Write a structure and sequence with these properties.
The structure is cut from a larger assembly and holds 2 copies of chain A, 2 copies of chain B and 2 copies of chain D. With 67 residues, chain A is an all-alpha fold. Chain A has helices spanning 2-14, 18-30, 38-45, 52-66.
């Protein structure tokens, strides 16, 4: 529906915003070396999928084992 | 000697910025126009879950004596969250739509202040019950 | 007849959230909850799409 | 608008730059030509789904701009009709009433509908030639065919329609640049063709007043089609007949600069290099304002090894001062071939200070310097041409390495050792590398 | 421009972006950091160092 | 500037500042008429200004001004980073 489409557009504009994807698109366009798969470019864009504190738990466990 | 060291580079940078902005806007337009909400199957309701709906449809939408006759409006559908909100009898269907309204009439004399806040949640539960849970449920109600 | 009544409750709900949304737009002008309202507005709008309720322009 | 036209000349490379230039012009000022160019550029959009995307839906602003340019304008209504017919399902139905508005309006001017078809043809001429949009030209041809009065239109207007369609077909073949562009030329050369009918109408003197103006361009396009087909001699003969007709009517009045360049190239392809130089000089003398043709005339005259006329033409080529990066280098090559060593060095320095050096001209100048051998001149010319003008080419690098080795013994083999790993995929470069290694060891 | 769009269509990043946006719109409880939800829908971004460390720890445990 | 050049005393630091101002919005004729005269008459013994003028002339006219780079190779401002910069400029001129 038109109202459903407008609500979806408004929600996408508000939450997350188009600038987050626009930065990735601008980086991909600025980099001339573009791979055959854009999943690698998305992974190079990264964004800390696991949290920094979440990834530090294994490092803290390894340090405690080394201690 | 043409003075192309400056100015030409600024024009090239402006053209590159305009091209990058146009490409970003094009990608955003493609992503926005790709939006669609997919069709999904109708979620089924359990027979025990359907047992509470039809009895409520008998109590709220088919009882002879209620406000609105046997065709009271607007239509309402039984949901467990709304029904538990009304719950929070000997016939087993206590704190129903008809039961609570006489009770809200009864509890107003004893505690109008308590009846004032509870009816606010009850009316919101009554408002939310107007929204049907499932597509075939409205067809079943009709 | 059942389809109009279901959309009537949603449209009043859509009017109620937009009243909160427009005030929050004024609140942002004087100064996030608007972004919280849009998904709830999308939740109400998709129910009209899910039930097949007629849309109002 | 001129910058946008120059960008749209190379449409497939900087289409975004052309769109940005058109948007800049439109934001700066409301121009009818700029708005038409923006609409014709956005009209294709890879089937209205490219980066412009719903430019079909955004062309309502273009329609409003057209209505602002003309309250009742046949060209504007035809442009809106073409946009609707190329991008809609039922919006052409509203365009038919828009065309019916002009049809009743055109009858009052007489008080036929010849102007109804003429409105689409003018947009077709602007799109195909000025805007260089073959897709927009095809869309305008479709709109002209979709005009309601197909049977009663004028044959001269129908001749103009056929000329516009032939121009659109040639533009489509040139813009595609693949498959078989000569297949359309073979169709045009086949019996009973529309270009043949246009040539027959040109030959007929009964209606030559309003038909020969388009028939001259039709004959030029037929000659270009024959040249693309391969019969270069017959194409040059037809082009010479067209040039004779141009001399009869007005020589530089048409000013077919690209056609003159094509004729000069076709004549230079055969052994008649001196005749090609004479034809180029004749065109340059006919059009003294276009000093850029003098550079090509001098380049053609240099091939006959007659340095006197070559220098005489090179003076007029160098009359256009700044934009002569190839002409100054050619004059330097001519002077180095005949005598003026210091003047040739100064002119080569001026050409290097200019924008771009020509690769073949630089190679010829390096060969001339190698013949009249000087180590500093060879290092200034060949090494610079290999570093900048021809970075990928390893033959120039091998030549520069040999020149440096001969200039400064085996101690200057740094570039030879650097470029000796990758050299031109063997063939004779293996023997060249063997000779270079022997010279380095010696 | 057009060539970049064709390359992006060949890569299929528009499809993954559309699936991510569809999942984000379908999930009712929208998180405050929608980029985190997008990354969770996408998979494992910049986890290579953690994967190498986990592989080293697993090899140490096995040996 | 022409009147000041006709006048006797050209100030070295002021001339260097004017040359830097011209290099900010570069003009080849102005650079050749300013920096060359500053490095020749005002401070011939100096090396950093000569290296800067050599870099400007090399960027202006490529291999025609390699004599200035060779002169910078004669004295490279007590070596240090200036010698490396002069070597980089000479490599760029060779390229």
């Amino acid at each position: 529906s038109e109202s459903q489409k407008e609500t979806f557009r408004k929600y996408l504009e508000q939450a997350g915003a188009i600038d987050v994807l626009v930065k990735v698109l601008v980086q991909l366009y600025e980099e001339p070396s573009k791979p055959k798969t854009a999943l690698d470019y998305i992974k190079q864009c990264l964004g800390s999928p696991t949290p920094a504190e979440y990834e530090a738990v294994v490092a803290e466990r390894d340090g405690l084992q080394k201690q | 000697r043409d003075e192309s060291g400056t100015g030409r580079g600024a024009l090239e940078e402006a053209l590159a910025e305009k091209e990058k902005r146009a490409k970003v806007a094009a990608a955003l337009e493609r992503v926005l126009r790709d939006v669609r909400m997919p069709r999904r199957p109708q979620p089924h309701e359990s027979v025990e879950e359907l047992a509470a709906g039809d009895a409520w449809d008998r109590v709220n939408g088919c009882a002879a004596g209620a406000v609105g006759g046997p065709y009271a409006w607007p239509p309402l559908f039984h949901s467990p969250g709304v029904q538990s909100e009304l719950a929070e009898a000997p016939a087993g269907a206590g704190c129903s739509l008809a039961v609570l309204d006489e009770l809200l009439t009864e509890l107003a004399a004893a505690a109008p202040a308590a009846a004032a806040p509870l009816a606010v949640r009850a009316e919101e539960a009554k408002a939310r019950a107007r929204v049907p849970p499932n597509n075939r449920k409205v067809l079943r109600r009709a | 007849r059942h389809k109009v009544a279901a959309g009537d409750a949603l449209e009043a709900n859509i009017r109620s959230l937009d009243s909160r949304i427009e005030a929050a737009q004024a609140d942002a002008q004087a100064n996030a909850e608007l972004e919280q309202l849009y998904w709830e507005r999308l939740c109400v709008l998709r129910t009209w799409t899910g039930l097949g309720i007629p849309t109002r322009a | 608008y001129e910058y946008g036209t120059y960008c749209l000349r190379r449409g497939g490379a900087k289409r975004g730059r052309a769109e940005e230039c058109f948007r800049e012009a439109l934001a700066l000022e409301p121009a009818h030509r700029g708005a038409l160019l923006a609409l014709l550029g956005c009209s294709v959009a890879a089937g209205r789904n490219t980066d412009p995307a719903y430019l079909e839906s955004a062309e309502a602003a273009a329609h409003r701009l057209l209505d602002v340019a003309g309250r009742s304008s046949l060209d504007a209504w035809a442009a809106l009709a073409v946009v609707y017919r190329a991008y809609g399902e039922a919006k052409r139905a509203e365009l038919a009433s828009c065309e019916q508005e002009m049809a009743r309006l055109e009858k009052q001017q007489l008080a036929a509908g010849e102007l109804q078809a003429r409105s689409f043809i003018s947009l077709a001429n602007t799109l195909l030639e000025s805007l260089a949009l073959p897709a927009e030209a095809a869309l305008a041809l479709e709109l002209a065919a979709g005009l309601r009065h197909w049977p009663s239109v004028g044959p001269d207007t129908r001749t103009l329609h056929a000329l516009a369609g032939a121009l659109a077909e040639q533009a489509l073949a040139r813009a595609a640049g693949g498959g078989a562009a000569s297949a359309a030329a073979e169709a045009m050369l086949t019996p009973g063709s529309s270009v043949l009918s246009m040539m027959r109408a040109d030959a007929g003197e009964a209606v030559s007043s309003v038909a020969a103006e388009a028939a001259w361009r039709c004959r030029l396009l037929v000659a270009q089609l024959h040249k693309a087909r391969g019969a270069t001699d017959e194409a040059i003969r037809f082009y010479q007949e067209y040039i004779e007709a141009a001399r009869s009517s007005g020589r530089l009045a048409e000013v077919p600069l690209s056609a003159w360049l094509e004729l000069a190239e076709a004549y230079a392809a055969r052994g008649q290099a001196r005749f090609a130089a004479d034809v180029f000089l004749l065109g340059a003398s006919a059009r003294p304002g276009c000093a850029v043709l003098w550079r090509g005339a001098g380049r053609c005259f240099v091939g006959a090894e007659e340095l006197g006329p070559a220098d005489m033409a090179l003076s007029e080529a160098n009359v256009l001062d700044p934009e002569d990066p190839e002409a100054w280098g050619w004059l330097a090559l001519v002077a180095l071939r005949e005598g003026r060593a210091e003047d040739a060095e100064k002119a080569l320095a001026f050409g290097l200070r200019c924008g771009l050096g020509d690769p073949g001209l630089l190679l010829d100048i390096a060969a001339e310097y190698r013949a009249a051998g000087q180590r500093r001149a060879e290092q200034r010319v060949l090494q610079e041409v290999a570093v900048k003008l021809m970075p990928e080419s390893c033959s120039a690098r091998l030549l520069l390495a040999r020149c440096l080795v001969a200039q400064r013994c085996g101690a200057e083999a740094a570039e030879a050792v650097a470029a000796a790993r990758q050299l031109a995929a063997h063939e004779d470069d293996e023997a060249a590398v063997a000779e270079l290694e022997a010279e380095l060891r010696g």
